[PDB]
Write a protein that binds this ligand. Structure first.
Ligand SMILES: [Mg+2]
Ligand SMILES: [Mg+2]
Lengths: 214, 253, 297, 138, 214, 207, 138
């Protein structure tokens, strides 16, 4: 049995996942965002979303504090995100994916590009002189429909696993996703969080949807 | 054995120019039947009795087939055979106090290799060691050499011991903390060193790049040492690297 | 005279007794058996046998040639009687083949024993590792001993007074192979007849010593006189009969002991085509005729 | 063959020695900034140029023609344009390109317009990077 | 007889299925993808696809648990993929082949190479120190045209064998195809999936195509 | 009476035949491929091609329903039936060397694989040497036309064997993506004798 | 595949050389303001134009059609309008536009109406940025 976690990530503020900055043509923005190479669409890498969600969930699940290596997390964190220990190799039940933005047509309706350029400066305190800089951000209002695959390994802890998943999504809504988050960027929201069965049917899929919607 | 390649070692050693020593080795003034008998008994007792006793001294995994006179045929674990080759050379050089030299051929074969071909190939290697002649100006071969697993790897005993074994010791002491990507890096080093002959510049550059990749779990000083060896003593370096790969191969043993 | 130069473009397997070993040359009985099998295939085995027995075609066995240097096995000469200096038959023990033209240098000494060996470099031996794949049992491994010739190296056969039938069988023998695993990828050569005048000088000369150039067995009426001041080596020839219409099962032929092709004699003999198979449907022949190169000793 | 590097040419038997010499001269008296240096170049400062060179090398190596096509010459021209870009973006790359003459080799390839000239240039670049590592790195 | 199963693998996300770090030092990443040695095209090894497919199918045909050795899992799995058991040598019905990148011309139309460098980093949870790393992936939207040979050992089990083959293909679409797939990579889709008879005409070939079609 | 079947074997997915279990080969790679003894170039041994072709032909000619058409082509010596042979295979050397050096590439590669434990999820890498795809091997197979009434059926079976090879592998880990080959420039020419039906044999081979 | 400049011509291969010569001409004879003052153009001065060019480049490159769409051409015409506006705002920017051929190239892209012409125009503007930063920079 395998499950798919549908949903959308809505940018409340501009998001900036750091790009390569070595292949985005010549004369582009100073610090570009990561984009799909083919479609040039900005994307949220599955690695970055997974890492932020794992950090927030491991910090909140353990005691509110988190100082250990990723392999020394709780049993729930290890069974959801995997472990590479010597004699304890947990196979991750969650398979994250790269998330390209889908509402490019909606953004083009308002005659705005997917990405903006944010102008910032740092004012040297001993000189009171400003140092302007430019960064690229995916504009607020962009939507990123994602898909996360859940391996239903144990029927006895799928409810707890999905409670943890909903908790991690909630924690991400009170934090940022990548980039200069403390400086106003990266705030996201989750809605249309629905889990569906990849093949066949799951007899507790209605309970999973209501804990994933509330 | 637990570490190494699951290979049999065949050693075939032979004293160089023993017949010449029996003919004119003894000065004409000191020629008698007693002196001839003393020399003959010394040689025969050395080979038979002392090879038995020396191999019994430490538990070498050797299965001596024949020692007899002037010759030697032993089969065992290839690492034990390789270790005992230098011991045999040193003990013979002590017993004769460097008046006679010995040539050896060491073959490496699997268990199910034909014994006739083991014997024939190791005899060919021993003949190649007896063909050793560092300069093509002298008369008669130097003959004080050993052939390592193939007729191209003929080295003199001093060359083998000093160069190859100090290089192997350094490689062992500097390569034990490499990852399983490091093993492939050593394989690539061997391939590049073998190909250096037909690629003077691009291949030495690739070797430099490989040493650069390696000099994170082996140190910068040994990467430079390997680079210096590759440009100065290459065939000895290839021999040492191949021996290290075969000794550290994790394919059972 | 009419040197049959063989250029091999595949590794060869000439077995002595085992499949895991290969020798660098093949004997005259091997070539005769190959040509007789070709003649049976094209239906004139009797004509070829009559040609060979009446000495219309008589050939030595295969010898190495390396860059227009024709080699001969080191003859077993009664010399080394120079009992003062040098190393006669001391360093002349790892020397297996001597050049046919440099034979007068070897007779009187002065041939470099060392230099004649590293100069002699024809290919190298190898072991091919194979299996019989079994779909449900355990695959049984086996191995074939092979020899691969070099670029300007091959084998050559001394034939005197060549024949159209011999040339026709040699053309067919190109596409059947010679040696052990020829139906696998091992018997493959090209041949030339290549008349030579330097070699004809050697074989038109007389002498008191006859170097046997092919595995030969003198007949019973002349073996005693052949064994007189002879310096020979006796070699066993045998193996299984290779035919489809013999005995309906694999059977070994009788062992024939012949003089090896480096032997030297003072009394000339002409051998025989011996029948080493008599209980089967067809005769099995072992070419043991004598090919001689005369020198002065 | 006979790739011009401004002062001295290189060919199939030379490129490695000159690449090593240029890299060693890089480490001897390295680049100096306005603020007295004293850093050297890193791989993630010419990585884009190296990736472009790798792409063009892959394109050329799959062609058997002795003369480079205009579609590949456009790629080499863009390589030169980019080399000019990061050369002006930071002076630590400008002197690296100047002393180890990337631009001269690119111009010579764009003049010869032959497959072998670009193959020699690619071998020279690979040797340059290989000797840049194992001596410097990063 | 012999059946040839054609199809196409479309990379939904960037795939890192490689382990080759050979040849040129022209500036390659330390973790390159596996490429065709002659054409330098990114390649999907038949062993990678076969192993991932066998793992997913053996887990699904058990079901959900795969802790046994590859030679002890299931009769259907053993007859499809092969068993080297000492007594019962079961021969593989499927012959996978290495798959090269097919749509290189289409990728060159978009002025993009077949492979990218994805920049990643790990955040030390105790020191909050980031450690960057670079990974090379085959571009999303890359297409791999594959052929898998199936041999009809008997026609009485071909329907079940092709049902299981389609099951494995579906299971790959909800999983990854080798590499850092749990962190967003390796997502694939199978399109233009069909089977044809190599020599002759299998009577139930339309049934197999209907199974493979949907 | 003797026909020469020519052709080329083109590697499609990388091919690994044989074990060169000598020190020189195993000292540079875990599992080497068969090389030429002197030139060290990769080859397809005549025994490997012959055995795989015979195996496929024996499967196809029976199909759960050896036989004479196999014994007359490949020979037999089992207990009482002894047919000698009609097909004479040859060791196939690598023909693409000057073409492979235009790609600045070596004839052989090392494929990095691994196996992942299913109980512990622990992986274990392995390296196999493999002849790179795009390598070409020109082969000659000699046919002894013993029977005039069976040559057409023998060549039909030869073409069937080649076709079965083209939808199979040739050596080594084939089911894991190795050893896929193609046949091109297949032709037969009479080397010894005169054979007027060589044209229909070429039609069979060119089919 | 070929954009017009007037007497001189730009193709898919010589775009970099023409951009380099145009930049070199500017640096050799820098623009003089009204008050006898020499001025150098800044990347930020034409940053909006460059981002407009790149914004429509992303949507052009995701289109395998020879003919440009109506909305793409609307965006390109708006880009030309913005180029004129920025030229009218700053005399030094107008001098940079006139010494180069941004107006000529953009109107030739409007004339040809084809996807490849705009791609070569983007190549030319990229080369102009690269060679501008190579010599003088920001
Ligand atoms: Mg001796
Ligand atoms: Mg002795």
């Amino acid at each position: 049995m395998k499950l798919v976690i549908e949903g959308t990530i809505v940018l409340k503020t501009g998001m900036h996942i750091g790009g390569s900055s070595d292949f985005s043509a010549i004369g582009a923005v100073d610090s570009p965002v990561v984009r799909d190479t083919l479609t040039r669409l900005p994307l949220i890498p599955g690695s970055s979303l997974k890492g932020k969600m794992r950090y927030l969930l491991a910090k909140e699940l353990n005691n509110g504090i988190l100082l250990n290596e990723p392999n020394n997390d709780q049993d729930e964190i290890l069974r959801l995100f995997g472990s590479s220990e010597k004699d304890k190799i947990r196979r991750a039940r969650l398979k994250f994916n790269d998330i390209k933005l889908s509402n490019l047509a909606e953004l083009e309706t308002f005659n705005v590009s997917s990405t903006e350029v944010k102008f910032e400066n740092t004012i040297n305190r001993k000189t009171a002189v400003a140092n302007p800089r430019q960064i690229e951000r995916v504009i607020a209002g962009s939507k990123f429909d994602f898909e996360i695959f859940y391996n239903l390994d144990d029927i006895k802890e799928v409810e707890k696993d999905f409670e943890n998943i909903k908790q991690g999504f909630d924690l991400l809504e009170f934090d940022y996703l990548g980039g200069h988050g403390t400086r106003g960027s990266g705030r996201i929201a989750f809605e249309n969080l629905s889990v569906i069965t990849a093949v066949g049917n799951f007899e507790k899929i209605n309970t999973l949807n209501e804990i994933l919607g509330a | 054995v637990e570490v190494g390649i699951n290979r049999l070692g065949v050693l075939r050693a032979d004293v160089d120019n023993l017949g010449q020593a029996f003919i004119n080795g003894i000065p004409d003034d000191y020629l008698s039947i007693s002196r001839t008998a003393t020399f003959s008994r010394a040689m025969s007792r050395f080979f038979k009795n002392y090879l038995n006793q020396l191999l019994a001294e430490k538990s070498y995994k050797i299965n001596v087939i024949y020692a007899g006179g002037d010759d030697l045929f032993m089969i065992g674990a290839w690492q034990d055979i390789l270790d005992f080759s230098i011991v045999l050379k040193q003990k013979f050089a002590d017993f004769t106090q460097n008046k006679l030299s010995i040539s050896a051929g060491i073959g490496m074969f699997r268990e199910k290799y034909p014994v006739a071909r083991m014997a024939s190939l190791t005899g060919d290697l021993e003949d190649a060691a007896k063909d050793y002649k560092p300069d093509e100006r002298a008369v008669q071969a130097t003959k004080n050499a050993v052939t390592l697993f193939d007729a191209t790897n003929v080295f003199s005993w001093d060359t083998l011991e000093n160069d190859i074994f100090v290089k192997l010791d350094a490689i062992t002491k500097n390569f034990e903390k490499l990852d399983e990507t490091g093993k492939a890096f050593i394989y690539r080093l061997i391939d590049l060193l073998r190909g250096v002959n037909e690629n003077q510049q691009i291949n030495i550059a690739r070797l430099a790049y490989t040493l650069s990749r390696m000099e994170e779990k082996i140190g910068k000083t040994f990467a430079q040492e390997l680079y210096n060896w590759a440009n100065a003593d290459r065939k000895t370096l290839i021999m040492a690297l191949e021996i290290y790969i075969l000794k550290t191969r994790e394919r059972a043993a | 005279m009419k040197i049959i130069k063989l250029y091999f473009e595949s590794p060869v397997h000439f077995g002595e007794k085992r499949l895991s070993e290969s020798k660098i040359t093949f004997s005259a009985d091997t070539l005769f058996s190959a040509l007789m099998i070709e003649a049976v295939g094209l239906g004139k085995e009797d004509e070829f046998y009559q040609l060979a027995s009446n000495n219309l075609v008589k050939f030595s066995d295969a010898f190495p040639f390396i860059d227009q240097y024709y080699y001969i096995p080191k003859p077993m000469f009664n010399l080394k009687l120079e009992k003062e200096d040098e190393n006669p038959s001391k360093a002349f023990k790892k020397l297996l083949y001597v050049p046919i033209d440099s034979l007068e240098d070897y007779l009187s000494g002065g041939l470099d024993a060392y230099f004649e060996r590293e100069s002699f470099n024809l290919g190298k031996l190898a072991l091919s590792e194979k299996v019989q794949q079994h779909d449900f049992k355990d695959s049984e491994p086996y191995n074939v001993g092979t020899f691969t010739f070099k670029e300007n190296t091959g084998l050559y056969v001394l034939i005197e007074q060549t024949h159209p039938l011999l040339e026709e069988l040699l053309e067919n023998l190109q596409y059947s192979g010679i040696g052990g695993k020829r139906n696998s990828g091992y018997g493959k050569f090209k041949f030339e007849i290549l008349e030579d005048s330097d070699i004809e000088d050697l074989f038109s000369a007389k002498g008191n010593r006859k170097i046997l150039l092919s595995g030969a067995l003198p007949k019973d009426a002349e073996l005693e006189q052949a064994l007189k001041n002879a310096s020979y080596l006796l070699e066993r020839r045998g193996g299984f009969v290779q035919s489809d219409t013999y005995a309906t099962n694999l059977v070994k032929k009788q062992d024939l002991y012949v003089f090896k092709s480096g032997s030297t004699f003072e009394n000339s003999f002409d051998g025989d085509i011996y029948q080493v198979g008599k209980k089967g449907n067809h005769p099995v022949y072992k070419y043991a005729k004598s090919f001689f190169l005369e020198v002065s000793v | 063959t006979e790739l011009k590097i401004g002062n001295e040419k290189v060919n199939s038997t030379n490129f490695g020695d000159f690449a090593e010499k240029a890299i060693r001269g890089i480490n001897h008296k390295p680049f100096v900034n306005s603020k007295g240096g004293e850093q050297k170049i890193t791989t993630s400062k010419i990585r884009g140029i190296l990736e472009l060179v790798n792409k063009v090398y892959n394109r050329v190596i799959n062609t058997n023609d002795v003369e480079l096509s205009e579609n590949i010459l456009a790629d080499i021209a863009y390589i030169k344009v980019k080399i000019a870009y990061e050369s002006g973006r930071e002076p630590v790359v400008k002197d690296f390109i100047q002393r180890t003459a990337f631009t001269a080799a690119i111009t010579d390839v764009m003049n010869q317009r032959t497959r072998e000239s670009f193959l020699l240039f690619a071998r020279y670049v690979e040797s340059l990077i290989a000797y840049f590592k194992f001596y410097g790195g990063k």
